[PDB]
Amino acid sequence: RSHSSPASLQ
Amino acid sequence: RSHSSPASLQ
Amino acid sequence: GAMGSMERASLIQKAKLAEQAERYEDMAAFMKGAVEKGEELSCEERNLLSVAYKNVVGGQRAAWRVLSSIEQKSNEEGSEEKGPEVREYREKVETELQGVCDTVLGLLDSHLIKEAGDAESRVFYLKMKGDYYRYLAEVATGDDKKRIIDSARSAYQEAMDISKKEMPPTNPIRLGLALNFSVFHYEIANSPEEAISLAKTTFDEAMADLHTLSEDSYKDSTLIMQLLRDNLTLWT
Amino acid sequence: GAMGSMERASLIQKAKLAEQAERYEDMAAFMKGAVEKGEELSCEERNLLSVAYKNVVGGQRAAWRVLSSIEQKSNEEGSEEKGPEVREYREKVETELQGVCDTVLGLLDSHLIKEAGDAESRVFYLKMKGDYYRYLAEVATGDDKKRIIDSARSAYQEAMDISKKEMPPTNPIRLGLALNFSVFHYEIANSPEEAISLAKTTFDEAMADLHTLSEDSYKDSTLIMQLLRDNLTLWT
Ligand SMILES: N=C(N)c1cc(-c2ccccc2)c(CCCN)s1
Ligand SMILES: N=C(N)c1cc(-c2ccccc2)c(CCCN)s1
Structure with a gap:
């Protein structure tokens, strides 16, 4: 499975 | 913390 | 109940699927529906019921312990006032936990225990009764805590009496019961010496009976024996 | 809503407590209540909203994938008929997942996106819109799947257009958007070459801008860049 973004971004 | 039993027993 | 229209066998099947999917709230709802069909539960079905509710509770x-710790820190000397929110949310989780324990206890009382005549079913259910009163005791304060503790003790003691008369010392149900009663003594009843004695005697009597077991049964019994040993290492 | 009587600040506080306790359904309910107060969300609050719903969905x-796999095995040649239960339970989980996605999309449409004027908020919300349409696309079959895919694409594309005009190539929101749009291309839109190209270009343009960053910002940007690289390794 491909990696998607973490939920928390700054 | 103390160890207690697993839920499944035979 | 919302499961009243589903076949017993379908509820069991879906509980097993829910387990595979790590959907333990669903698993518990399915097994509650299965219990409420009114038939006794097989060994496998009792284990599904226990797995489901043990994972939910x-x-x-775990959440209650996180919140209770934050709350205790908030009540130290020198900590800032942050309002009623920590207490309110700890209480919300606590009330949900008590609701789950009450549900399990209600299934045991209506009517799993009274129909359980074989040692393996009766001890299993009485151990469960002790466990869910123990989980209630973990969060209890005020005027009923003593009675909750005594309810746990009474269930565990009845289960112990049956197990010692009717099961060999290596029986995994007997072992898991003794393990959990020892945890009750140590963590709930302020009786560490009783906990240590029970764990030691249980371990030693099981050790002496391992020679009677097949390879597969030996693996089952020694797994629980290792938990007794782990606790003894922690407690001594 | 059941949170209508709770203060906005208390909902935020309790969302943070729920996060600490790993109670993500509660966290999401609290953040939904906070959104419904009608005020815009700060950066920290947007992140709490996203953390809550990302963990729930x-x-x-994960459960849907387990069930869908069991179901596909059940529909092979030589597999036994086991009744409608696998399909029914997969459908139950699917419907709950679609409900969560629809809830998030509803919050974005009523009225987070239309009030978001700064690039950092608007791109964040449009990325979220693309993500939750992508999660709908993962389970979609039948006559609306193409439209769901196009809705994801359209949201991601609007977010990309803003991000490229208004943010530096190392901005973590821009990077996470490009990462997720590349996943959309690879996993949803059957466009692996587009996915690879986007990931490569995003990585290289960020690399060339790292020299402008503080140590702390460098850590934030390189963390997401490594995910782009991990996908490129998987895809090539
Ligand atoms: N689905 C589960 N979790 C379990 C099912 C069973 C079981 C299966 C057949 C017959 C009796 C019991 C367990 C026994 C406990 C192992 N130590 S565990
Ligand atoms: N409670 C959480 N999970 C998070 C909170 C925040 C935040 C805190 C202050 C200001 C803006 C954002 C995160 C930023 C994302 C890190 N990469 S994450």
Whole structure:
């Protein structure tokens, strides 16, 4: 499975 | 913390 | 109940699927529906019931401990006032946990225990009764805590009496019961010496009976024996 | 809503407590209540909203994949008929997942996106819109799947257009958007070459801008860049 973004971004 | 039993027993 | 229209066999099947999907709230709802069909449960079905509710209450207990710790820190000397929110949310989780424990106890009382005549079913259910009163005791304060503790003790003691008369010392149900009663003594009843004695005697009597077991049974019994040993290492 | 009587600040506080306790369904309910107060969300609050719902839908997606696999095995040649239960339970989880996605999309449409004027808020919300349409696309079959895919694409594309005009190539929101749009291309839109190209260009343009960053910002940007690289390794 491909990696998607973490939920928390700054 | 103390160890207690697993839920499944035979 | 919302499961009243589903076949017993379908509820069991879906509980097993829910387990595979790590959907333990669903698993518990399916097994509650299965119990409410009114038939006794097989060994496998009792284990599904226990797995489901242990996982549900396990998440609640872990959350309660996180919140209770934050709350105790908030009540130290020198900590800032942050309002009623920590207490309110700890109470919300606590009330949900007590609700799950009450549900399990209600299934045991209506009517799993009274129909359980074989040692393996009766001890299993009485151990469960002790466990869910123990989980209630973990969060209890005020005027009923003593009675909750005594309810746990009474269930565990009845289960112990049956197990010692009717099961060999290596029986995994007997072992898991003794393990959990020892935890009750140590963590709930302020009786560490009783906990240590029970764990030691249980371990030693099981050791002496391992020679009677097949390879597969030996693996089952020694797994629980290792938990007794782990606790003894922690407690001594 | 059941949160209508609770103060906005108390909902935020309790969302943070729920995060600490790993109670993500509660966290999401608190953040939904906070959104419904009608005020815009700060950066920290947007992140709490996203963490809550990503964890909820993440558990649902994982469960759906387990069930969908069992179902596909059940429909092979030579597999036994086991009744409608696998399909029914997969559908139950699917419907709950779609409900969560629809809830998030509803919050974005009523009225987070239309009030978001700064690039950092608007791109964040449009990325979220693309993500939750993508999660709908993962389970979609039948006559609306093409439209769901196009809705994801359209949201991601609007977010990309803003991000490229208004943010530096190392901005973590821009990077996470490009990462997720590349996943959309690879996993949803059957466009692996587009996915690879986007990931490569995003990585290289960020690399060339790292020299402008503080140590702390460098850590934030390189963390997401490594995910782009991990996908490129998987895809090539
Ligand atoms: N689905 C589960 N979790 C379990 C099912 C069973 C079981 C299966 C057949 C017959 C009796 C019991 C367990 C026994 C406990 C192992 N130590 S565990
Ligand atoms: N409670 C959480 N999970 C998070 C909170 C925040 C935040 C805190 C202050 C200001 C803006 C954002 C995160 C930023 C993302 C890190 N990469 S994450």
